[PDB]
Structure formats: C-alpha cells, structure tokens
Amino acid sequence: SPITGLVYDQRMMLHHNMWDSHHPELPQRISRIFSRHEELRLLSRCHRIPARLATEEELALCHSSKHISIIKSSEHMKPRDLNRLGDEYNSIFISNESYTCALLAAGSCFNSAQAILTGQVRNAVAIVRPPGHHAEKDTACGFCFFNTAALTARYAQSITRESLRVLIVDWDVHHGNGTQHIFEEDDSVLYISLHRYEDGAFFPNSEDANYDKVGLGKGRGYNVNIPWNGGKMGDPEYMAAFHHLVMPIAREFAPELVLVSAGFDAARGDPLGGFQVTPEGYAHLTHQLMSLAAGRVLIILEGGYNLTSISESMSMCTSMLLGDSPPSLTPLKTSATVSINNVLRAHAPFWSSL
Ligand SMILES: O=C(CCCCCONC(=O)c1nc(-c2ccc(N3CCCC3)cc2)cs1)NO
Ligand SMILES: [Zn+2]
Ligand SMILES: [Zn+2]
Ligand SMILES: [Zn+2]
Numbered sequence: 001s002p003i004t005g006l007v008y009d010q011r012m013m014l015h016h017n018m019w020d021s022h023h024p025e026l027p028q029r030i031s032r033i034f035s036r037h038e039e040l041r042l043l044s045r046c047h048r049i050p051a052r053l054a055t056e057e058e059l060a061l062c063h064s065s066k067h068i069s070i071i072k073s074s075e076h077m078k079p080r081d082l083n084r085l086g087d088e089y090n091s092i093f094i095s096n097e098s099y100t101c102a103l104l105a106a107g108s109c110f111n112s113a114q115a116i117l118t119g120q121v122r123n124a125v126a127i128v129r130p131p132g133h134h135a136e137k138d139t140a141c142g143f144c145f146f147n148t149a150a151l152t153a154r155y156a157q158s159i160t161r162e163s164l165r166v167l168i169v170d171w172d173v174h175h176g177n178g179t180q181h182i183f184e185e186d187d188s189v190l191y192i193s194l195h196r197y198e199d200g201a202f203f204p205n206s207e208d209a210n211y212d213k214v215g216l217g218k219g220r221g222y223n224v225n226i227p228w229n230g231g232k233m234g235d236p237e238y239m240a241a242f243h244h245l246v247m248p249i250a251r252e253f254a255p256e257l258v259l260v261s262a263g264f265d266a267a268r269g270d271p272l273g274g275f276q277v278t279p280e281g282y283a284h285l286t287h288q289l290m291s292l293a294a295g296r297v298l299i300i301l302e303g304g305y306n307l308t309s310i311s312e313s314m315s316m317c318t319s320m321l322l323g324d325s326p327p328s329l330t331p332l333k334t335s336a337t338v339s340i341n342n343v344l345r346a347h348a349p350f351w352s353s354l
C-alpha cells in the first residue's frame with residue numbers, strides 16, 4: 001500500500017576493521033542514514049522489506065566458486081589470518097562478520113528487487129554495507145566483497161526473464177570496475193558510471209574507467225563511462241551529464257528495471273571524493289531516473305563517508321522515490337564539458353538520441 005520499500009538491518013553494522021575502528025567505511029554509515037530517514041519522517045511512509053542472506057547459488061550468478069569459497073572461509077579465521085587475507089586485496093579489511101554482512105547486503109537487495117517486480121512496491125531503497133561495485137568475478141576490492149548491484153540485476157532476470165532490460169546507474173565517485181567487467185559483453189544490462197578519473201590517478205587507477213571503454217562484442221555500446229578530470233565537480237556538472245548523456249541513453253535503452261549504485265562520496269564534505277554535489281542535486285538525479293521503468297528504481301548504497309552528507313543525500317533520494325516535489329535547483333565547468341563531449345563522441349556510434 002506504500003509505494004516505496006525500504007530495507008535496513010543493523011546486523012550489517014557488524015562488519016568492522018579490527019585494527020582501525022576509525023576506518024572511513026564505518027558501521028554507523030547505515031544507521032545514520034536510517035536514523036535520518038526517521039527524523040525526516042520517511043520511515044513511516046515506507047513499507048519495510050526484511051533483509052535475508054543471499055544463497056551461494058545466488059552469489060554464483062556473478063562470482064566464481066573460488067572467490068565465494070575464500071570470503072566464506074574468513075568466518076572462522078583468527079585475527080592474524082583475517083589481517084593476512086585482507087592485505088591480499090586492494091583496500092580491504094575483514095572481520096568474522098564480514099561475510100554475513102555481505103550476504104545480508106545482497107539478499108536485502110534481492111528482496112527489494114522481488115518486491116518491485118511482484119508489484120508489492122513501486123520502488124525501493126537499500127541502506128546496505130559493505131559496498132559492492134568494485135567486486136569482480138574473482139576478487140574483492142575497494143571495501144567491496146560481492147557485487148550487490150550486479151547480483152541484484154541477475155537475480156531480477158532469473159525471477160522474470162533472462163532478457164529483462166536492467167539499467168545500472170553508478171554515481172558513486174569511483175568507477176564501478178567490477179560492475180563494468182561482469183556486464184562488459186551483455187546487451188541486456190546497461191552500465192552507466194560517472195566517476196572521478198584524473199587520467200587514472202584516482203582509484204581504482206585504471207584506463208578501464210575511461211570514456212573509450214564501450215563494452216565488448218554484443219555489449220558494444222552497453223557500457224557508458226563518464227570520467228571527470230581536473231575539476232571540483234558538483235550539481236551543474238552532474239545535471240548536465242544527465243541531460244546530455246545519461247537520460248537520453250537510458251530512455252533509448254528503455255529499461256524494465258533501474259538499479260542505482262548510489263555511493264554518496266561525490267557529495268560536498270566527502271573526504272575521499274573531494275567533489276561538491278548537494279543533497280538537492282541527488283534528489284534531482286533520482287527524480288529524473290524515476291521517469292524510467294514506470295518509476296521502478298532501486299537505490300543501493302555504495303560509497304559515501306561524510307555521515308551528514310550521506311544521511312541527507314540518501315534521505316532526499318527516498319523522498320523523490322516517495323513521489324515528493326524536488327527542492328529547487330551555476331554555469332558548467334569547462335573540463336566537465338570536455339568530458340561530456342568525449343563521451344558523446346564515443347557513444348554516438350551506438351545511441352541515436354545522442
Ligand atoms: O568509495 C568506494 C571505495 C573507496 C576506496 C578508495 C581507495 O581506497 N582507500 C582510500 O582512498 C582511503 N583514503 C582514506 C582517506 C583519505 C583522505 C581523508 N581525508 C582527506 C581530508 C581529511 C581526511 C581521510 C581518509 C581512508 S582509506 N567505492 O565506491
Ligand atoms: Zn516526510
Ligand atoms: Zn561511479
Ligand atoms: Zn553492459
């Protein structure tokens with residue numbers, strides 16, 4: 001009867017860094033977001049979707065059995081061994097609760113996707129950790145263990161039809177390399193990422209994130225990278241990318257389900273991103289995406305490390321999902337226009353609306 005679903009479970013707080021309790025991927029990222037939804041009176045307006053563990057068979061939709069095996073083995077490791085295993089990846093910490101939390105993150109999003117696709121709710125928001133989009137088929141990376149968003153997209157296909165057109169918009173400030181690679185040869189899933197690039201000087205520090213990686217084989221044109229260079233990007237920049245690139249392509253793709261890899265580390269005040277997108281900015285992005293897929297949008301928390309900025313930003317997205325009017329509203333930075341024009345040029349061969 002509520003149109004918007006919401007999934008949050010404090011067990012996902014159990015994932016922690018044993019050797020640095022102040023690591024930015026904090027447990028209270030999700031609880032602060034949830035707590036803010038309560039303050040802004042959005043929680044009463046949402047249907048509460050239960051969290052569940054993703055099954056191993058569901059993980060296998062995207063991830064190798066080897067990968068699965070290793071992350072599962074972490075459950076019964078001593079601190080010394082957690083430390084060792086952790087340091088085999090780029091930017092990873094592990095606790096005994098990490099695996100459960102990563103399962104909970106994915107399963108929550110599966111339930112949310114199922115609630116949308118069965119008409120229980122129109123749209124949903126997933127306040128989950130740890131994040132997902134850096135997770136490859138074979139490896140963890142960048143605080144991510146499994147690719148929640150990628151898995152949810154496959155889950156959706158498997159409970160509907162395999163050709164179900166799924167759009168993934170990734171506005172985390174980092175490139176979702178794992179998501180890109182998983183669907184790199186897929187024309188049924190459209191990946192669109194905006195991220196700080198700085199010619200590969202920004203994590204995850206690869207040319208994979210550049211505008212010229214457009215997908216492979218059948219997937220040619222179904223991977224859209226929008227890299228930012230030499231600019232403190234904000235609302236004008238993201239609004240322009242949406243108007244010129246994201247929304248035109250998305251409309252032409254005509255998805256049946258929209259998944260947002262919603263990192264809020266492009267927000268003003270975020271220590272890792274150093275960009276200045278506002279909560280109102282994020283609202284207007286959500287609002288625009290809701291014109292797709294009859295409003296069937298699933299917002300999935302990725303990055304974002306300023307507790308105030310992420311709590312405010314994500315609550316605003318939920319407000320849009322609930323059907324509220326956007327809050328109101330600077331000329332575009334040059335380098336942003338350079339970036340946009342490079343992407344227009346690279347994707348003109350695929351999308352006629354460009
Ligand atoms: O978001 C993600 C995943 C993030 C993975 C990024 C790379 O791996 N790790 C990092 O960069 C880290 N950097 C910090 C850090 C940097 C700057 C500051 N500060 C600058 C000013 C003062 C405070 C504080 C903390 C902690 S770890 N995916 O979407
Ligand atoms: Zn309200
Ligand atoms: Zn991104
Ligand atoms: Zn693709």
Ligand SMILES: [Zn+2]
Pocket residue numbers: 210211212213214215223224225226346
């Ligand atoms: Zn591209």
Ligand SMILES: [Zn+2]
Pocket residue numbers: 172173174263265302303304
């Ligand atoms: Zn990020």
